[PDB]
Amino acid sequence: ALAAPPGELTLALTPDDKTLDPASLDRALAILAEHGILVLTGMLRTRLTDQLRTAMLDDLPEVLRQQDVPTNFVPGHVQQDPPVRESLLFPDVLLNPVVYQITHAVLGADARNAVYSGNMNLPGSHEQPVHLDEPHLWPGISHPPYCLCVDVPLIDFTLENGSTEYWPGSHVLNPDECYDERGCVLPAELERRRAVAPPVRFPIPVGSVVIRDGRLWHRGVPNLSAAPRPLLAMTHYTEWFDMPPIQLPDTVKSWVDGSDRHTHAHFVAGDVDHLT
Ligand code: NI
């Protein structure tokens, strides 16, 4: 069992680091190209993650009261958006300079964030099937990345509370008849891959940010703790990939809109209801 993120996937920062130096950026990119997953430690201040964790746990009762609680694949992996109230929208989270340095270098200067969502993994949750969150664009074709998932754990993720299983290097795999309509990986391909490059799972401390290819094979797993495990999730896409805009209150337009760290946003006059 791993006690920490593996050194080969990890770059250590502080919240004062606003850019990676050239050698660190090169390493970040080499990790993403080879392994499809990069763990950045020490990115976000406690003040921010505390507030986001508290807001998501406070919203959970409303989410659980809905008629059909929306889940990712199997019981206990609840889809839950974080609030888009002005007081909980932070430049260092939505427009993190290190994250965008990386996504600009991989996806281009006009890459844009188009997801502001989350995954609440409840106590007693089930095992998800191995899947990709975003598909390859044509079957049987090798092509470069068009999207990067930016995952923000809001508590310490442990082997006990449902730290995600990742399949390193799987982001480039796209043989024929590999994926079903839900993005789940066909069992024959899973087992062939396992023999060559087995999956890994490891603790990730709150304050970290995980950047990964949207095509990376992974699965959520059971949370065997007594506490819900919140993840905040964003996804950067090439400018040409069609996505609906993120609904944001126009009280953040001044700093969101016109930044060179792009967001595909629609700005609204009221407060936005993130939950319904
Ligand atoms: Ni997933």
UniProtKB/Swiss-Prot annotation:
Catalyzed chemical reaction(s): kanamycin B + 2-oxoglutarate + O2 = 2'-dehydrokanamycin A + succinate + NH4(+) + CO2
The protein's Enzyme Commission number: 1.14.11.37
InterPro entries per UniProt: Fungal_Metabolite_Diox, Phytyl_CoA_dOase-like
S-adenosyl-L-methionine in keyword set: no
UniProt cross-references to Pfam families, sorted A to Z: PhyH
Gene Ontology biological-process entries: kanamycin biosynthetic process
Pathway the protein contributes to: Antibiotic biosynthesis; kanamycin biosynthesis
GO molecular function ontology, one term from the record: 2-oxoglutarate-dependent dioxygenase activity
Family affiliation: Belongs to the PhyH family.
Main function: Mediates the conversion of kanamycin B into 2'-dehydrokanamycin A during the transformation of kanamycin B to kanamycin A.
PANTHER family reported for this sequence: PHYTANOYL-COA DIOXYGENASE FAMILY PROTEIN (AFU_ORTHOLOGUE AFUA_2G03330) (PTHR37563:SF2)
Protein name: Kanamycin B dioxygenase
Organism this protein belongs to: Streptomyces kanamyceticus
Gene it is expressed from: kanJ
